[PDB]
Amino acid sequence: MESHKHYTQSETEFLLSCAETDENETLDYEEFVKRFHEPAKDIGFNVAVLLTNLSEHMPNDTRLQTFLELAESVLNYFQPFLGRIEIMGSAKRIERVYFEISESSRTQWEKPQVKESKRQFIFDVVNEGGEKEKMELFVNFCEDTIFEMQLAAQI
Amino acid sequence: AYQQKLLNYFARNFYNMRMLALFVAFAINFILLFYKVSVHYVLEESSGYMEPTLRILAILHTVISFFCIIGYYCLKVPLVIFKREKEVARKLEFDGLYITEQPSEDDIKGQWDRLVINTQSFPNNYWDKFVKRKVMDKYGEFYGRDRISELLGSAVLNSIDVKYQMWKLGVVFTDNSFLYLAWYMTMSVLGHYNNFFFAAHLLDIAMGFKTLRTILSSVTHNGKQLVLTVGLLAVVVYLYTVVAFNFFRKFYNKSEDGDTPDMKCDDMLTCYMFHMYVGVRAGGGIGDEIEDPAGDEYEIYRIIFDITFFFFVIVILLAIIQGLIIDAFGELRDQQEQVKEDMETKCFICGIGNDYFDTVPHGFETHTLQEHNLANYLFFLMYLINKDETEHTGQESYVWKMYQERCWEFFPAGDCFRKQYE
Amino acid sequence: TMSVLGHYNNFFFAAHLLDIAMGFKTLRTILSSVTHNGKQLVLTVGLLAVVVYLYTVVAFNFFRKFYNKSEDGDTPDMKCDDMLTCYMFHMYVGVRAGGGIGDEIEDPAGDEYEIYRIIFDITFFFFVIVILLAIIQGLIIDAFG
Amino acid sequence: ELRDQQEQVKEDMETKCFICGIGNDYFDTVPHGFETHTLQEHNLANYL
Amino acid sequence: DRLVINTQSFPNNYWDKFVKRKVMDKYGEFYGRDRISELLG
Ligand SMILES: [Zn+2]
Ligand SMILES: [Zn+2]
Structure with a gap:
């Protein structure tokens, strides 16, 4: 663990005294705090969403900058996991909603058959089709794509 | 569950065996180049397996065509029927066309979907049993609870929805891709019978x-x-x-x-x-x-x-x-x-x-x-x-x-x- | 090497005209x-x-x-x-x-x-x-x- | 030149109307306002 | 280009002998001075 060059050594020993103390020295990595660390991952995810939105609404604050860079490794972990869009949330103003993206849906989105259906859909929405309800046809494609990844993961 | 797992496998290993079927078709082209007019037969080179691997590879290619049509049934067929059930369900939502509009003799693709609303197991592979009873609630106060009732309607033999399956396969047959691969398999069948037209698989x-x-x-x-x-x-x-x-x-x-x-x-x-x-x-x-x-x-x-x-x-x-x-x-x-x-x-x-x-x-x-x-x-x-x-x-x-x-x-x-x- | 082969056999020597x-x-x-x-x-x-x-x-x-x-x-x-x-x-x-x-x-x-x-x-x-x-x-x- | 003429017809029916003549930059601010602007605000047969 | 990093005279006609010892300094505290010695030769 210390050969992984990463941590601070007193905190490695903190994790050691945390670890299992399982009767000789043995330890299962999954049963460590890991299984409870994914809800801790959820908490830190929400914290990352929070600090993100703090920077996004109200930028340019060196207090917040120090607090942000203080939380550097969390934003390093969770940018593969966050979800972010923009909408008009009934306030007649441009808004943005930050949210969660699970990973297994991205693994079934990693399936490039979806990507080529997507690129053909790009061709469709650009030219091949009556420009009628653009984003509604997009969401029709999305619901179909949802069903596609349901099929893909369910195998 | 053996056969279920094998359908899962053929789903998750589908395009690879498609390209392998194409490679077998190239091997079909490799042989169909040594025929002799006498009836007909094959000449001989140092390789000594013309007729046995001929017959075996023909049966093999036909079996791979069967595997790819079964896999394609296991593949996108629920996605296409998902799109179809979605479209029909929302057109009963936002129009109630079978209630009110009654579309023309064009698109009995669409009027084909009349007799599946007859089935109690109509909106199956669209997860959205909401739509049935919402449309049941939305219009029959105007137009009739009897109209709502009309728009309602090993050993496992007759406890499966027959007419749903009939409608389903009728929609399936409308695909150009499905009919393409099915016709391709029947070409493999005819080549299994008479291997003269057998090399016409090269529309792969x-x-x-x-x-x-x-x-x-x-x-x-x-x-x-x-x-x-x-x-x-x-x-x-x-x-x-x-x-x-x-x-x-x-x-x-x-x-x-x-x-x-x-x-x-x-x-x-x-x-x-x-x-x-x-x-x-x-x-x-x-x-x-x-x-x-x-x-x-x-x-x-x-x-x-x-x-x-x-x-x-x-x-x-x-x-x-x-x-x-x-x-x-x-x-x-x-x-x-x-x-x-x-x-x-x-x-x-x-x-x-x-x-x-x-x-x-x-x-x-x-x-x-x-x-x-x-x-x-x-x-x-x-x-x-x-x-x-x-x-x-x-x-x-x-x-x-x-x-x-x-x-x-x-x-x-x-x-x-x-x-x-x- | 085409010039070499033409130095040896000047039949292929005029194939230099991919210059x-x-x-x-x-x-x-x-x-x-x-x-x-x-x-x-x-x-x-x-x-x-x-x-x-x-x-x-x-x-x-x-x-x-x-x-x-x-x-x-x-x-x-x-x-x-x-x-x-x-x-x-x-x-x-x-x-x-x-x-x-x-x-x-x-x-x-x-x-x-x-x-x-x-x-x-x-x-x-x-x-x-x-x-x-x-x-x-x-x-x-x-x-x- | 025939395909150019037909595609420019499909351009001008979708970018700048006869009576609008601005572009589809301005008029799509609201929920499909350019479309309704065509169908309602210049609505070619209604001047007739 | 793996087996030219084996050479001590790897980064010759790029005037930039900086790069060798900077990469030598940058990672072997994490991953190994022996790894630095291997990427020397
Ligand atoms: Zn935008
Ligand atoms: Zn105008």
Whole structure:
């Protein structure tokens, strides 16, 4: 663990005294705090969403900058996991909603058959089709794509 | 569960065995090149397995065709039936067309979906049993609870929904891709029976490496005009033949020198098909079949006639074919370059331009990758439907309500949070 | 090394004239119009060869008398029965044809098989020559565009 | 030139109307306002 | 280009002998001075 060059050594020993103390020295990595660390991952995810939105609404604050860079490794972990869009949330103003993206849906989105259906859909929405309800046809494609990844993961 | 797992395997290992079936088709081409007219047979080289691996590889290729049609049934068939059930369910939502509209005799694709609403297990593979009882609730207070009742309606033998399956496979048969691969399997069946037509499996090269397929697309999208133009050509050949039937009944002699029992093309048909087969596969003129200039004053106009054929035929022919094919290529390159335009100038949700968004260190690129990030709206919709509505934020429940409304103004009209202040 | 081989045997010595492939650039842009698209060109010619293959095979099952390679048939003629021979025969004849196989075909004698055989030659003419010109100059002028 | 003329017809029916003549930059601010602007605000047969 | 990093005279005609010892300094505290010695030769 210390050969992984990463941590601070007193905190490695903190994790050691945390670890299992399982009767000789043995330890299962999954049963460590890991299984409870994914809800801790959820908490830190929400914290990352929070600090993100703090920077996004109200930028340019060196207090917040120090607090942000203080939380550097969390934003390093969770940018593969966050979800972010923009909408008009009934306030007649441009808004943005930050949210969660699970990973297994991205693994079934990693399936490039979806990507080529997507690129053909790009061709469709650009030219091949009556420009009628653009984003509604997009969401029709999305619901179909949802069903596609349901099929893909369910195998 | 053995067979279930194997269907799962054929799903998750589908295109690889498709390309392997193509490679087996190439091996079919490898053999069909040593036949001898005696009945027929095969010659011999140092390899000594012509007939046994012939029969085995034929049965193998047919079995792989069976495997790919079963896998394709296990593949996209639920997605297509998902699209169909979605469309029918929402058209009963937003119209109640079987309640009210009763569409015309066109699209019994659509009226085909009448008799599946008869089934109690109508909206199955669309997860959305909501739609049935909502449409049941929405209109029969106006139009009839009896109308609602009408729009209602190893050992496992008759406890399965038969008419749903009938409707289902009827919708399945409408696919061009499904019928393509099924017909391909029946070609493998006929080659298993008679391996003369067995090498006609080489329309497998019509749905692989896509550039040939775009060339075939350049063929097929314009082809109505092509076929009607060839019909116009046939009209020209028809009337042009008829002209050399009234005034011209000596200038053709099919035999040698005419003393041998020659034939002037007098008969309508014979003269019809003669001008077709000669002048289309000509090489410019009918200078072969014409009488050469002997000095007749009729033959002067007959030479002028051959000139009019040459001019008003060959020019027209090349205008038919490669003008239209290069026109097809021009529109194909235009469509692909406009796709590459719109993916790089104005996004779907942005729709402004790359004038505004490159002010900062590559902000247009990140604006694409982050701010509209096309698959993440998909992930967001997943994140909605996965959650419960109690669990929603007011933003989440808001967008959910707008989604149920099918109203779409919640999506940005194009301007963004960079556009408002920056 | 071509100059070396010409120093040894000055028969291949004049094959140095691919030196005109990397000088005055307009010819080289024409060669660029050739080479950037050429994957599609070669695969299309392969598709053409597939068409010739199957189209030959069609005139192997139903058609085993309409070709006679010698003079008049009494001299020991050859119907293209052999797969290869018939393969390469259709390739060398119909590709370097000038439209039709009106040379090698039996002319309309009156056989009802020969009606469909004339229709067969028409299908060759149409689905070959049109396709050929579409292969070559459509793609080359597309490259120029 | 024939394909150019037909595509420019499909341009001008979708970018700048006869009576509008601005562009589809301005009029898509609201829920499909350019479309309704065509169908309602210049609505070619209704001047007739 | 793996087996030219084996050479001590790897980064010759790029004037930039900086790069060798900077990469030597940058990672082997994490991953190994022996790894630095291997990427020497
Ligand atoms: Zn936008
Ligand atoms: Zn106006």
